Amino acid sequence: DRAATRDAITKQISAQQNQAAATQKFDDMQAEVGQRGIVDQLRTLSAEGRAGEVNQILEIRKELTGVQDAIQNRQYRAAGEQRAQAAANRAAEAHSLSMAAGFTREQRDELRRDRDEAKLVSGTIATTFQDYDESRQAQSEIMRIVGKEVGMPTDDQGMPDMSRASQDQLDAFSNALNEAGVQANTSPTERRNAVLKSLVDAGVSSKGIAQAKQEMELRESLEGLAPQDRTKVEATIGAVNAELDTLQRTATEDYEREVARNPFVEPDKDPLGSVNKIVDKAVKSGFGWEGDRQDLNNMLVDFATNGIKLPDGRTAVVPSKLLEQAFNTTNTWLFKNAGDVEKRIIELMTTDGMTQMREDAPTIRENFLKTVSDIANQKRSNAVKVTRSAEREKG
Amino acid sequence: DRAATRDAITKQISAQQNQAAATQKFDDMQAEVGQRGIVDQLRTLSAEGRAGEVNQILEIRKELTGVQDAIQNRQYRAAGEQRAQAAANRAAEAHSLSMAAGFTREQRDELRRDRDEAKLVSGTIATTFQDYDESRQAQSEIMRIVGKEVGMPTDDQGMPDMSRASQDQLDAFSNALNEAGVQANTSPTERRNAVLKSLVDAGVSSKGIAQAKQEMELRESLEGLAPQDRTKVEATIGAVNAELDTLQRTATEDYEREVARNPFVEPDKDPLGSVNKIVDKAVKSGFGWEGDRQDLNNMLVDFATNGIKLPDGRTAVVPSKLLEQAFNTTNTWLFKNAGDVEKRIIELMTTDGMTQMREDAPTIRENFLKTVSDIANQKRSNAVKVTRSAEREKG
């Protein structure tokens, strides 16, 4: 548990509560309390994935090949995006842990703050849209009932067809609206300002506000499109983002392989419980500490918790397999006292190649974070440009 | 493990990281993460093999014999090429190990460097094409959807037929492009310059750059061809390379038989653990070392690791079966002390025929390497000439 005093906690903590609320709301929505729709998986992680799920809800070899190709492309893109996001989250957590040596915000927590603001924006927008959808369906019930009562050309969804509805056809709906209902449906403006206020309540930099406004314009444009036109637009967006996706995924495999090579770039809390077995290797037919197994365990967990005092004047946490290979010598009789083993680990951590790898780890970590941030920014930028160009061209 | 200090490592190490990245990317692509295409094996080792796999994806006795003949010829050529490549790789590794006696680059590592540059070029180009293919399919989804919407003559692939598409037919695609999409697809230029920069990042001699440019021109020409015309062109390339393939394969059997004859041309790390059994033959009813089994093992592994001091002033590593036949005499009582057995092996390695075979091994090894390099260069040269001539003749 944490016993630290919050005190002012002006930033990164109100955002923490807001992101906790967003996560619990997403979990509750995914749990599907009661009976609802979502026949398919309906992950709704992103706009492209949500459009793919909607399509899933919806000569012969032509369509047989086309449907399969669409499914394969959508699944590949979504899997790549989600794996990249998870890897970036893990890398950001590792970078924050590494920087937390020594509320000490600096550039690392600045990057953390902007990424968390983006995550908060995305979660809040998804929650707002999900909440709106239920009201849309509830009101569409009455739109369909009224349309059937007066009688308009309708399809499986029940709402009168936009293309087939003439002015006289829409006159029945106008008369019904004049009669009762009073459903203004003006939310497409009020909505975003409300969200803005919530963001103002949370505290967001101008970049996050711009991202939220762009998400509003693109989401409203997408909602205004017909299902077929919406699918066409989202698939064109996927095509124009394909090269960015390929660059992002390739960078992710490169950086995760580098992580697999480097323990310093990614620590782990599991080996904190592993070190005990190494203690056993100091006892079985071996001359180690003079009956100081508890002392050895305490000093090893301290070293794996706070780190060794590097001679340069810094403190670095020793990883697991480097520690065990340092302990595993040709004959254990050489390493008996605590001073000897700490001198051994100190001199081994000061290896030239090991040192170079140590200061290489944060650089590659921050490069990975910067690259994924730039990839996301470029994806959003090309998406907003294409969507606004299409909207202008249509009308 | 290796504890050497990298320090500058300007060459052959950045290339090492790049080739490691290429190999892991190839392994990941071959693993087929998730669901994708590639109904057949789809090895995609070379252009000819990839074309054969594509054909595999695609009176009566006429076609029955023709398909079988095509499959047999393609399989034979691909198997010969891959076996030759593997044998050449093993020979190059053995030559590097032999030269490493005594970062000592010389002509052997110059040949290694140029071969590694060629391998890096091939791997990077294959990875770039594989990455591009997914985007091509994703965008072809929308091209097919739009073409079906407006309505062009189409086949199982879904894209409108090039020959059947008139100017008026392509006017629908032009209007759709003016409408939305904004898919420039200008990569066929930017792509290669990007690769060039990566090569500039890696560090490549001018010959490698020329090879990469030729691979670009031939790959783009192949991509521009129709499937039937592409098959015709690749089969003509195989026919014009058939004599080079025959020369290459015959040279490979000759040189691998010579390797089977000569241990000096190809050592092995396995007998390093085998020598121990010979030690047993020195104990069972035999007068050998005076209780120095560990000393004998240490001296034998040293001899098989660093080599014996030849009287000429050089150091050569003794092979396995020559060693065991040196030890296996008519009566083991003659060879008891270490000095006697080392004198025996020294005088046996100085045999006139054995010596001649010793200096014959590197010569035949480098001849094999030069021959395979020339075969590859001539194959690429005739391929580029035929492809450019065909491209000029078509248009």
The DSSP code sequence of B184-196 is: ---HHHHHHHHHH
DSSP assignment letter at A332: G
Q: Which of B226, B214, B327 is nearest to B275 (CA)?
A: B327
Question: Own/partner pairs for B297-303, CB < 8 Å, 24+ apart?
Answer: B299/B338, B299/B342, B300/B275, B301/B272, B301/B275, B303/B345
Q: Which of B20, B19, B14, B22 is nearest to B130 (CA)?
A: B22
Q: Round to whole Å and give the CA distance between A287 and A331.
A: 10
Q: Round to whole Å and give the CA distance between A298 and A295.
A: 5
Q: Round to whole Å and give the CA distance between B139 and B156.
A: 16
Sole residue written with tokens 């017909």: A226
In this structure, chain A runs to a length of 395
Sole residue written with tokens 């709402």: A159
Q: Coil, strand, or helix at residue A285?
A: coil
Q: Which residues pair with A309 in a beta bridge?
A: A315
DSSP assignment letter at A333: G
Q: Which residues of A touch B37 (CB under 8 A)?
A: 72
Task: Kindly provide the b/e burial profile for residues B246-270, where b requires at least 16 CB atoms within 10 angstroms of the residue's own CB.
Answer: eebbebbeebbebbeebbbbbbeee
Q: Which residues of A touch B183 (CB under 8 A)?
A: 236, 239-240
Answer left, alpha or beta for residue A337, where phi above 0 means left and psi between -120 and 50 means alpha: beta
Q: Distance, in angstroms, between A364 CA and closest chain B CA?
A: 15
Experimental method: cryo-EM
CA distances from A296 to A156, A275, B71 (A): 72, 10, 67
Q: Round to whole Å and give the CA distance between B378 and A293.
A: 69
Q: Round to whole Å and give the CA distance between B22 and B211.
A: 18
Answer left, alpha or beta for residue B12, where phi above 0 means left and psi between -120 and 50 means alpha: left
Q: Which residues of B touch A77 (CB under 8 A)?
A: 138
DSSP assignment letter at A317: -
Q: Round to whole Å and give the CA distance between B329 and B351.
A: 17
Q: Coil, strand, or helix at residue B160?
A: strand
Contact between A99 and A106 under an 8 Å Cβ cutoff? The reply is yes
As separate numbers, helices (DSSP H) first and strands (DSSP E) second, chain B gives 14, 2
Q: Round to whole Å and give the CA distance between A258 and A360.
A: 10
**What H or E segment, with its residue span, contains residue B209?**
helix B206-224
On whether any CB of chain B is under 8 Å from the CB of A76, the answer is: yes
Q: Round to whole Å and give the CA distance between A377 and A374.
A: 5
Contact between B84 and B372 under an 8 Å Cβ cutoff? The reply is yes
On whether any CB of chain A is under 8 Å from the CB of B144, the answer is: yes
User: Using the beta-carbon criterion (under 8 Å), do B131 and A250 form an inter-chain contact?
Assistant: yes
Q: Say which of A77, A242, A390 has its CB closest to residue B139.
A: A242
Answer left, alpha or beta for residue A12, where phi above 0 means left and psi between -120 and 50 means alpha: left
Q: Say which of B24, B142, B157 has its CB closest to residue A235.
A: B142
Q: Round to whole Å and give the CA distance between B84 and B245.
A: 9
Residue of A76, A83, A352 to mutate for B, most B C-beta atoms under 10 A: A76
CA distances from A136 to A36, A159, B170, B176 (A): 14, 12, 41, 32
CB atoms within 10 A of CB A314: 12
Contact between A323 and A345 under an 8 Å Cβ cutoff? The reply is yes
CA distances from A80 to A47, A225, A244, A387 (A): 15, 27, 11, 23
On whether any CB of chain A is under 8 Å from the CB of B304, the answer is: no
Question: CA B5, B9, B14, B20: dihedral to nearest 10 degrees?
Answer: -30
Query: CA B95, B99, B105, B108 torsion: positive or negative?
Result: negative
Answer left, alpha or beta for residue B44, where phi above 0 means left and psi between -120 and 50 means alpha: left
DSSP assignment letter at A315: E
User: Using the beta-carbon criterion (under 8 Å), do A73 and B141 form an inter-chain contact?
Assistant: yes
Q: Round to whole Å and give the CA distance between B2 and A94.
A: 28
B131, closest residue in chain A (CA to CA): A246
Q: Which of A235, A177, A179 is nearest to A387 (CA)?
A: A235
A86-125 residues touching B, CB cutoff 8 A: none
Q: Round to whole Å and give the CA distance between B274 and B321.
A: 11
| Beta strands A315-316 and B308-309, pairing class | unpaired
As a 3-state breakdown, chain B gives helix, strand, coil percent values, each rounded to 5, of 70, 0, 25
Q: Round to whole Å and give the CA distance between B47 and B152.
A: 31
User: Using the beta-carbon criterion (under 8 Å), do A239 and B142 form an inter-chain contact?
Assistant: yes
Q: Which residues of B touch A235 (CB under 8 A)?
A: 138, 141-142, 145
Q: Round to whole Å and give the CA distance between B113 and A38.
A: 58
CA distances from A332 to A281, A289, A311, A336, A385 (A): 9, 11, 26, 8, 66
User: Using the beta-carbon criterion (under 8 Å), do A393 and B156 form an inter-chain contact?
Assistant: no
Q: Which residues of A touch B144 (CB under 8 A)?
A: 66
CA distances from A5 to A9, A99, A337 (A): 9, 21, 40
Q: Which amino acid is at A278?
A: I
On whether any CB of chain A is under 8 Å from the CB of B354, the answer is: no
Q: Say which of B3, B35, B141 has its CB closest to residue A235.
A: B141
Q: Round to whole Å and give the CA distance between A244 and B393.
A: 37
Q: Round to whole Å and give the CA distance between B266 and A367.
A: 44
Answer left, alpha or beta for residue A159, where phi above 0 means left and psi between -120 and 50 means alpha: beta
Q: Which residues of B touch A238 (CB under 8 A)?
A: 138
Q: Which amino acid is at A178?
A: N
Question: CA B125, B128, B133, B138: dihedral to nearest 10 degrees?
Answer: -170
Could you tell me the resolution of this structure in angstroms? Answer: 4.2
Q: Distance, in angstroms, between B6 CA and closest chain A CA?
A: 7
Q: Round to whole Å and give the CA distance between A96 and A371.
A: 17
DSSP assignment letter at B259: H
Sole residue written with tokens 């001849």: B367
Q: How many CA atoms lie within 13 A of B265 on its CB side?
A: 25
Q: Which of A52, A62, A240 is nearest to B145 (CA)?
A: A62
Q: Round to whole Å and give the CA distance between B35 and B21.
A: 23
User: Using the beta-carbon criterion (under 8 Å), do B141 and A66 form an inter-chain contact?
Assistant: yes
Q: Which residues of A touch B187 (CB under 8 A)?
A: 243
User: Using the beta-carbon criterion (under 8 Å), do B145 and A235 form an inter-chain contact?
Assistant: yes
Q: Which residues pair with A308 in a beta bridge?
A: A316
Q: Round to whole Å and give the CA distance between A252 and A266.
A: 15
